[PDB]
Design a protein around this ligand. Structure first.
Ligand code: E27
Ligand code: ZN
Length: 257
């Protein structure tokens, strides 16, 4: 039922999912001036050398590139995190125009898109149990701006026509998510939630300061995807972002400056 339209978009989600008005909802605006530099924060450890991508799926809201998370192969640690978080999937949120599309904002700035690399805490055994825990997930968020192409993105862009509509999937092996990372791993971090229903308050958000650039042609291909299934009226998959939510009783920490 939920989606991103006038009638079922973010401002409606609270009726099915009451925590949408909770105390640690995401995304948020990152006020860079009031983010607290924490010299005790560690460098993020991104260990994606042995990542095994499996498949790409249009789930009707976005597309997910899924990984084999049945061993410690692509893991996130360090940073604000205790213990080890395994990559399960990544996906993006993007706009109908270059001036919008990110979920997090930085001093109210919206990026064209935002990449979420979703990881679950191995102490909880699997993703489904992890999302019921307050430290269950760690999502690495990376902003996308439009400029020069991201060559490491092109494999993803080129398979989108094979997953145009809801429920379509395609094999997607040997994709290296290191090609989606900017040079710096400087980040902001704060406790929050899934940005999509069920909006569970289980995420440590780690948002990189440095965006990656992607070309106008790459983001255009995102915008040709469909939220509908095959054989249904075409509604372009665009503006699949949730706006900034109240920060409430939270502090955003900076690993830099
Ligand atoms: N936008 S986000 O917060 O990074 C984020 C997005 C998503 C998705 O939207 C993937 S599609 C997706 N469909 C479902 C259905 N039920 C779920 C129940 C619990 C948890 C996830 C669920 C889910 N995720 C999954 C995890 C995260 Cl952390
Ligand atoms: Zn997301």
């Amino acid at each position: 039922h939920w989606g991103y339209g006038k009638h079922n978009g973010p401002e409606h989600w609270h009726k099915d999912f009451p925590i949408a008005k909770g105390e640690r909802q995401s995304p948020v605006d990152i006020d860079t001036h009031t983010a607290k530099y924490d010299p005790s924060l560690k460098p993020l450890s991104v260990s994606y050398d042995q990542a095994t991508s499996l498949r790409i799926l249009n789930n009707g809201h976005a597309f997910n590139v899924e990984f084999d998370d049945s061993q410690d192969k692509a893991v996130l640690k360090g940073g604000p995190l205790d213990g080890t978080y395994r990559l399960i999937q990544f996906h993006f949120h993007w706009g109908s125009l270059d001036g919008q599309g990110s979920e997090h904002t930085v001093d109210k700035k919206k990026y064209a898109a935002e990449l979420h690399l979703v990881h679950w805490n191995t102490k909880y055994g699997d993703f489904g149990k992890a999302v019921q825990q307050p430290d269950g997930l760690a999502v690495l968020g990376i902003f996308l701006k439009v400029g020069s192409a991201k060559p490491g993105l092109q494999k993803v862009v080129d398979v989108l026509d094979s997953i145009k509509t809801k429920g379509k999937s395609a094999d997607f092996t040997n994709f290296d998510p290191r090609g989606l990372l900017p040079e710096s791993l400087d980040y902001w971090t704060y406790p929050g939630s899934l940005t999509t229903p069920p909006l569970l308050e289980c995420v440590t958000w780690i948002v990189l300061k440095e965006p990656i650039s992607v070309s106008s042609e790459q983001v255009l291909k995102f915008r040709k995807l469909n939220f509908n299934g095959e054989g249904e009226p075409e509604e372009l998959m665009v503006d699949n972002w949730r706006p900034a939510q109240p920060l409430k009783n939270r502090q955003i920490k900076a690993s830099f400056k």
